[PDB]
Amino acid sequence: EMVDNLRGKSGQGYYVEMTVGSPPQTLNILVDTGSSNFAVGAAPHPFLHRYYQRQLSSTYRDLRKGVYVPYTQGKWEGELGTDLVSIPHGPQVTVRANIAAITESDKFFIQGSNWEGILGLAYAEIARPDDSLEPFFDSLVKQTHVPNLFSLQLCGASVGGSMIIGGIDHSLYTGSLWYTPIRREWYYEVIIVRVEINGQDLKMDCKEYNYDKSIVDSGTTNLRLPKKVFEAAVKSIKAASSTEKFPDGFWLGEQLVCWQAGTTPWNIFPVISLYLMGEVTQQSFRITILPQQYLRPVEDVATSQDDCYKFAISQSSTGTVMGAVIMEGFYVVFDRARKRIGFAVSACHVHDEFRTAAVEGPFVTLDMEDCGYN
Numbered sequence: 001e002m003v004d005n006l007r008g009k010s011g012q013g014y015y016v017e018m019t020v021g022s023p024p025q026t027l028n029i030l031v032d033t034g035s036s037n038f039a040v041g042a043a044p045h046p047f048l049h050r051y052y053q054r055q056l057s058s059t060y061r062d063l064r065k066g067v068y069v070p071y072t073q074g075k076w077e078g079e080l081g082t083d084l085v086s087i088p089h090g091p092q093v094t095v096r097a098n099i100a101a102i103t104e105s106d107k108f109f110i111q112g113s114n115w116e117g118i119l120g121l122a123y124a125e126i127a128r129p130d131d132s133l134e135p136f137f138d139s140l141v142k143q144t145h146v147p148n149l150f151s152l153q154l155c156g157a158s159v160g161g162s163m164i165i166g167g168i169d170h171s172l173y174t175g176s177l178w179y180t181p182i183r184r185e186w187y188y189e190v191i192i193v194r195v196e197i198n199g200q201d202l203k204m205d206c207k208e209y210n211y212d213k214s215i216v217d218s219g220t221t222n223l224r225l226p227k228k229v230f231e232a233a234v235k236s237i238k239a240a241s242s243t244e245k246f247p248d249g250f251w252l253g254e255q256l257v258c259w260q261a262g263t264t265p266w267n268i269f270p271v272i273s274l275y276l277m278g279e280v281t282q283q284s285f286r287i288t289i290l291p292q293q294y295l296r297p298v299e300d301v302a303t304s305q306d307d308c309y310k311f312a313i314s315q316s317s318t319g320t321v322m323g324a325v326i327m328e329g330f331y332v333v334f335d336r337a338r339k340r341i342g343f344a345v346s347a348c349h350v351h352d353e354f355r356t357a358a359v360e361g362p363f364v365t366l367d368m369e370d371c372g373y374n
């Protein structure tokens with residue numbers, strides 16, 4: 001039914017099948033917890049196989065309002081309207097939703113990605129043009145009896161996974177679910193209270209980890225870190241991996257590292273532990289990230305005598321982003337109803353014979369400081 005209803009290509013987002021208009025036009029839509037607009041290509045573009053044709057939908061209504069959305073990467077502009085929307089491999093309901101018909105774009109659509117639009121699953125507070133444009137999931141919950149919750153199991157060229165709408169599929173994770181509070185309903189903002197690289201605390205004032213916010217974002221590929229944290233992390237990872245020396249360009253994400261097929265030296269790269277604020281005062285839990293996650297494979301037939309990777313941790317000036325490579329191998333529950341995000345080990349979790357991704361707790365901290373930046 002809903003299990004395995006996501007596809008994708010590495011570094012290019014995960015998408016779900018949707019239909020818009022009447023009769024239904026089928027489109028693949030990138031699932032994005034880091035924005036709040038539902039938008040679809042609605043005019044020819046070199047990288048689009050198909051696009052939303054408003055003239056062929058009897059139920060389309062123009063809202064006579066333009067909209068512009070700049071992301072960290074890429075931007076588009078379009079015309080707002082509403083139409084009927086469904087998810088073939090989700091709940092069997094049909095909802096009228098706001099849709100931005102994209103008429104121009106810059107570095108947004110990706111050659112070969114196989115998606116034609118984006119589903120912003122965050123809150124109205126960051127919807128453009130403003131917060132009166134009701135996001136899709138809000139519309140879904142208002143117009144049907146779907147529980148106000150969804151979960152994402154992203155798995156690691158072709159990738160897959162599941163978006164479970166309205167509930168939690170227990171066959172998709174093992175162990176316990178640990179919940180961290182949604183600090184504010186705009187992005188899915190959370191609080192990181194501690195960061196360790198191979199068990200070694202980075203030793204920063206914990207507000208540094210959340211300057212100016214930390215978010216959980218399926219629509220961004222990398223773990224993005226504030227400059228101060230990024231530099232400390234790179235130094236610690238370099239030192240752990242010092243048995244091999246890589247060009248500075250690798251660490252900046254401007255260059256691949258490759259090894260002969262099957263011989264990637266996983267064991268010289270450290271695990272990264274991110275401790276998230278718990279549901280009880282001064283308690284936390286950690287999720288552990290292996291190099292199989294933060295060294296992202298770049299598929300290319302020309303380089304295929306080797307396995308090559310990009311360093312999927314990069315610097316941010318807009319706060320921490322726990323992107324797709326962080327979510328991969330975890331089952332992540334976006335529990336809007338109880339303003340919390342849950343993490344558990346995924347059915348498709350990453351591991352070799354020495355180490356595995358984990359979600360564990362509780363941990364206690366004596367420093368009663370608030371790690372939230374504002």
Ligand SMILES: CCN1CCN2CCS(=O)(=O)N(C)c3cc(C(=O)N[C@@H](Cc4ccccc4)[C@H](O)CNCc4cccc(OC)c4)cc1c32
Pocket residue numbers: 011012013030032034035036070071072073074107108109118126217219220221222223224314323
């Ligand atoms: C999947 C496409 N992709 C591939 C590569 N990289 C590059 C490395 S990276 O992950 O560090 N990074 C900068 C990158 C950043 C983004 C990126 O901005 N993704 C957006 C969705 C999106 C999906 C497909 C194409 C273009 C954009 C999120 O929505 C942003 N969420 C935070 C945010 C920021 C600013 C405004 C805003 O408004 C709502 C929201 C995407 C990539 C990369």
